[PDB]
From a paper:
LH2 complexes are oligomers of a basic α/β-apoprotein dimer, each of which binds noncovalently three molecules of bacteriochlorophyll a (BChl a) and one or two molecules of carotenoids. Light energy absorbed by LH2 is rapidly and efficiently transferred via LH1 to the reaction centers, where it is trapped in the primary charge separation reactions. Overall, the cryo-EM maps and the corresponding models of the four LH2 complexes are very similar, all with a ring-like structure in which nine α/β-heterodimers oligomerize to form a nonameric complex.
In the deletion strains, PucA-LH2, PucB-LH2, and PucE-LH2 complexes are produced at all light intensities, whereas PucD-LH2 is only made when the cells are grown at low light intensities. In the PucD-LH2, these two key residues are α-Met-44 and α-Phe-45, resulting in a loss of these H bonds and blue-shifted absorption. The average Mg2+ to Mg2+ distance of the B850 dimer in the PucD-LH2 is 9.6 Å, and from dimer-to-dimer subunits, it is 8.8 Å. Finally, in the case of the PucD-LH2, there are no H bonds to its B850 BChls. A single C31 H bond produces LH2 complexes with a B850 Qy band at about 825 nm, and where there are no H bonds, this Qy band is blue shifted to about 800 nm. Therefore, in the absence of these “locator” H bonds in the B800-only PucD-LH2, there is no clear structural indication that the strength of the exciton coupling will be reduced, which could have, in principle, resulted in a blue shift in the B850 Qy absorption.
Author numbering:
A (entry chain G), E (entry chain E), G (entry chain C), I (entry chain A), J (entry chain I), L (entry chain Q), ...: 1 to 48
B (entry chain H), D (entry chain F), F (entry chain D), H (entry chain B), K (entry chain J), M (entry chain R), ...: 3 to 51
C (entry chain S): 4 to 97
Write the structure that this text describes.
């Protein structure tokens, strides 16, 4: 809440696609991490 | 000049801070949704059991 | 001039031409037509319209609006405003 | 000027909001199809059985 | 629905291909994740 | 102006919709071939047997 | 069929190669997914 | 006039259609070679035996 | 044979490399797919 | 705190995205390293 | 001249140094959060036990 | 031999690097394919 | 113009056809070398034995 | 220290990011090399 | 030796870095190929 | 030492980063090659 | 001329060498920290034991 | 005229053929070094033994 | 012209040769450090033992 001038020095058409894309990528990385290093997520997907 | 200066990105300071206000509020929404997902995983997964 | 730390000379040069090490000729010159090594002709000339292989026709001509192969309509028109397929509102605004 | 300002993307605010209207509608159609696919999985797959 | 001004600062010819492509990529990631971490999807593909 | 406006992509709305006419037609041909391919897979593969 | 104006804001020389190329990618990804997670496609390729 | 418009790619429609005339002819030759390759595979590989 | 106006909107110096390049790439993907999922191609390469 | 003339010679719209992006990437690399070379992190993810 | 020079990045020195002051302060907060995350891992993980 | 006009519409400083580079790439792919799916090439490299 | 048109690549048809004359010659040399490499593989490898 | 004219011929907004990025990349490559080819680092990460 | 005009149509600042880089890359590919498909190179590196 | 005119046709801000970067990359490739195909480097890293 | 020449990067030699002074000083600090890191490894790790 | 044509790369035919003169020389040196490396391998490795 | 001609890279032949002077010097220093590393490896590693 004090970094709001960053868009005077970083182009919004760069920083906003990078910000949203990075969060999207790294959400998927945490899912794949927890998916591959646990049993219970695969059990939930496999169900009955 | 200063408050009306168009910076090389094509934004004023006020335009920059209004844009960031969407970024801040969007981050707060994301955190809230994630807090619920962690609460749900605490309830239904073995994670902290 | 740069001294460096690895003795002298550091470069070689000559005034006339590239003094290559691996003998001579280094290149072949060409005053006229391309002298290929795999016989002739190398290309086929085209004097007018493309004398295709694989039979004709080769494209379908068009002299008006596009005709679909998959039935009309292909596009839904719009006037006035975007019609929602998922109810209203589609936005919040100041 | 202000309400008719062309922003650096070459769009007005109205053109931007009209464009986003397609984005919201497409997002809602995507979710609706996905809900049916999840329901089909709930019926035919062992997922939540 | 309150983000409609995003396209005043992110170029549509950037953000729309990025949006549609990122969704298509991450649709396939979820299919591959569930396909590799379950038995029933492979059984469905293998059929009889 | 507007119906003859050239947009930043260098197309009019009419040229854009004429281009999309090919996009929709191609998509429908693609699905038609894919439907036959899934029909052949249903006939010859064990998929749904 | 209501998205016909997309080419007023996404450049055809960008979005058309991206569309056709992404579809070709998606086709191959599905073939590889089914080929690797089934026996019958490999048996079909392997033949007699 | 319309047929002599030079489009943003720097081509006329007639030049574009002459270019595509090479693309279609190439595609037909490619398929013809591929058909013989599949015939050779049918004769010598176990594929459909 | 009705798409001949594609080159008024897709630059040939982009789309023709992308066309021929994608065809070559995907020919190789099919060879690698069949090579890795059959015995008889390797037996053909291995010969006697 | 003495490098602050770096932004007279590196463009902020290049260096700030590269900085924040590289930090985020390498945070994830350290998590993936410790996750894949320990038992107790996977044990924590797997819970009871 | 010199203290009012605009460099090829489009900043003065003072604008550059004010920008870096955010970068330094952000680095300090990142370090401070990481120190506590390391302290928590020391308390709860086997790491240095 | 009838495609000689291709260089009026594809830039030589693009298509010639891409042509020669793609041939070089795909020569190596065929070598790696035959190398990994035969014994006799590895035997020839291993020698006595 | 047409018979001496400089196309957007900066070449005439004659310069393009001259350039492609090298491309064809190189392709024929490449195939001739590859044919002898296949003959050597036929003589020394088990490939077709 | 005698290479100080490098920045008259390499753009600082290219070479300084490439320098610091390459250093950070290759620091991580060394940590991964040692982490994967030793036991004592993993034992240190695994702790008690 | 008859291809000397190639640099009238391919930019030297593209084709020379690509020529040298492609040879260097593909030199290393041949080393890694023989290194992985023989015993004696590993013996030579491993020594006594 | 006779190639000193290379920088009249290859841009220094391209060729110098490419040269130094290629060397640094391929140094690491040789270290990883020897590290993975020998025991004594791993023993040296592993120590006692 | 020479000391005042603005080279294609937009720097004088004096500014180029003043920039490199930061590059050298940064390299020295990096090496100093790395030396301590190898000393700490020599003390606590089995590396050279 | 013709031999003084500056082609789109910024070189004359002469400068192009001069540049290629270094390329052919470098190629020949590379092959000579490689011939020795293959001879050394023939002497010191089982390759053709 | 030739001694003063500026080439498309923005360098004279003289400045190109001065730049390459640093490249040759750096190459020699690199090989010198590598030879020492090779000697240390011949001493301490089993490589040629
Ligand atoms: C060794 C430290 C420096 C070095 C310092 C010098 C010096 C000093 C000189 C040269 C000179 C020469 N250098 Mg130099 N040079 C190095 C690297 C190189 C490399 C390379 C691929 O590494 C090359 C090709 C060259 C090229 C050359 C020639 C152009 C020239 C004549 C060679 C000669 O026989 O001199 C004669 C032979 C020698 C100088 C070497 C004698 C070695 C003796 C027998 C052993 C000494 C052992 C020493 C005490 C061991 C401990 C310390 C260190 C481990 C070295 N240098 C390294 C980076 N170079 C010479 C010059 O400029 O002439 C005008 C010169 O005098
Ligand atoms: C050897 C060091 C140099 C070399 C130095 C010379 C010299 C010197 C001359 C030529 C000349 C020629 N070079 Mg040259 N040249 C080399 C590399 C090449 C290559 C290549 C693919 O490697 C090619 C195609 C050529 C091409 C040619 C021809 C244009 C021309 C006549 C052929 C000939 O018999 O040359 C000579 C022979 C060879 C290049 C190779 C012979 C190979 C045989 C099979 C083995 C020789 C073993 C040797 C005696 C062993 C001991 C000494 C050293 C250990 C090498 N050069 C290397 C890089 N070249 C001649 C010319 O016309 O110049 C105007 C000439 O006088
Ligand atoms: C073989 C060495 C050269 C070659 C040299 C020649 C020569 C020389 C001639 C042609 C001619 C032709 N070539 Mg050529 N050509 C080669 C590769 C090719 C390839 C290819 C895909 O590899 C193709 C499609 C062509 C295409 C063609 C036609 C345009 C034309 C008539 C063919 C024919 O049947 O002639 C008749 C048959 C043949 C040329 C093949 C003969 C095969 C015999 C068994 C062995 C030949 C030995 C060889 C010539 C010896 C010297 C070279 C090396 C030492 C091997 N060339 C290679 C690169 N080509 C001819 C023409 O019409 O020119 C006006 C002609 O005179
Ligand atoms: C076969 C060699 C050539 C070919 C040569 C011809 C010729 C010659 C003619 C056409 C004609 C036609 N071609 Mg064509 N054509 C080929 C590939 C294609 C392909 C494709 C996807 O492969 C398509 C869609 C077309 C499309 C068409 C139509 C526009 C048109 C009418 C169909 C017809 O019955 O033709 C004729 C038949 C066929 C295209 C296929 C017949 C195949 C038969 C069953 C097997 C032949 C084997 C052959 C003798 C083997 C040895 C020689 C060579 C190895 C081929 N061609 C290949 C590249 N084509 C006609 C036309 O436009 O006339 C003005 C015509 O007379
Ligand atoms: C089959 C070849 C063409 C095709 C030929 C036609 C024709 C001809 C007409 C339309 C018309 C229509 N088409 Mg169409 N159409 C195709 C693909 C599509 C697809 C799609 C996702 O594949 C869609 C959504 C549409 C959409 C539409 C509507 C806008 C419209 C009214 C449909 C209707 O129910 O008509 C009534 C039903 C039909 C036309 C066909 C019903 C087909 C049934 C359901 C399935 C049969 C499968 C068959 C066995 C497959 C194998 C045989 C062949 C190998 C294909 N087309 C393919 C590519 N279409 C009509 C229109 O309004 O024109 C003005 C019309 O006259
Ligand atoms: C289902 C097909 C369409 C759809 C069609 C409609 C229709 C039609 C309307 C809305 C309306 C609304 N839609 Mg919508 N909408 C869809 C997807 C969405 C999604 C989403 C994430 O998927 C969201 C958030 C929204 C958002 C909204 C709100 C702005 C608004 C009020 C909703 C509400 O609760 O109304 C109250 C509840 C309802 C409208 C749903 C009632 C469902 C009843 C109980 C069951 C009907 C079954 C039916 C007979 C089955 C066969 C036909 C079809 C398969 C539906 N839509 C999909 C893509 N939407 C309304 C609006 O804006 O009015 C001006 C409206 O009337
Ligand atoms: C792989 C294995 C096993 C081990 C590897 C372990 C290793 C090597 C770990 C290495 C870790 C390292 C190197 C970590 C480094 C972390 C660093 C450098 C963190 C940096 C953080 C920086 C931050 C948060 C920067 C924030 C910047 C901000 C907010 C900038 C804002 C700018 C604004 C508002 C513009 C203002 C402009 C003006 C003009 C002032 O208005
Ligand atoms: C990998 C594992 C195991 C777990 C990971 C699970 C996770 C994290 C899953 C996450 C899933 C997520 C985040 C899904 C998100 C989906 C979303 C956001 C979907 C969005 C869809 C949007 C769509 C279809 C948008 C369409 C837009 C369109 C057609 C726009 C058209 C524009 C046009 C015609 C231009 C109009 C121009 C004017 C001038 C206005 O006329
Ligand atoms: C993976 C598995 C198991 C199986 C896959 C097997 C497969 C699919 C293999 C496929 C192989 C294929 C497709 C091989 C194709 C090879 C081809 C097309 C080779 C082409 C070679 C072309 C060459 C050598 C071209 C050379 C061009 C040159 C020298 C051009 C020079 C131009 C110059 C001098 C410019 C002149 C300019 C002017 C203005 C005229 O002066
Ligand atoms: C894979 C295996 C097993 C083994 C491989 C091991 C290997 C090969 C390891 C190799 C390691 C190597 C090569 C390490 C090299 C490290 C190096 C070169 C480190 C360099 C560090 C450089 C640094 C920190 C540079 C900092 C630069 C700075 C702060 C620049 C600031 C510039 C500013 C403020 C601009 C000033 C502007 C003006 C106007 C002049 O004031
Ligand atoms: C993977 C396996 C198992 C096997 C593969 C093994 C193989 C093939 C290994 C191959 C290794 C090779 C090819 C190694 C090559 C190393 C080389 C070429 C190293 C070169 C080093 C060059 C260096 C250090 C150059 C430095 C240049 C510098 C500092 C330039 C400075 C320029 C400046 C200051 C600008 C001056 C400007 C003016 C105006 C002139 O003053």
């Amino acid at each position: 809440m004090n970094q709001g001038r960053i868009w005077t020095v970083v182009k919004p058409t760069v920083g906003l696609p990078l910000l949203l894309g990075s969060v999207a990528i790294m959400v998927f990385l945490v899912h794949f991490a927890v998916l591959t290093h646990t049993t219970w997520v695969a059990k939930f997907m496999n169900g009955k | 000049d200063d408050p009306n200066k168009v910076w090389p990105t094509g934004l004023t300071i006020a335009e920059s801070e209004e844009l960031h206000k969407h970024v801040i509020d969007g981050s707060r929404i994301f955190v809230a949704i994630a807090i619920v997902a962690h609460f749900l995983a605490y309830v239904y997964s073995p994670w902290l059991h | 001039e740069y001294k460096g730390h690895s003795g002298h000379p550091l470069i070689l040069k000559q005034e006339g031409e590239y003094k290559g090490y691996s003998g001579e000729p280094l290149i072949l010159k060409q005053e006229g037509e391309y002298k290929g090594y795999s016989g002739t002709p190398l290309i086929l000339e085209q004097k007018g319209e493309y004398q295709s292989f694989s039979g004709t026709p080769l494209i379908l001509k068009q002299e008006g609006e596009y005709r679909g192969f998959s039935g009309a309509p292909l596009i839904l028109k719009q006037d006035g405003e975007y019609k929602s397929f998922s109810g209203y509102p589609l936005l919040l605004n100041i």
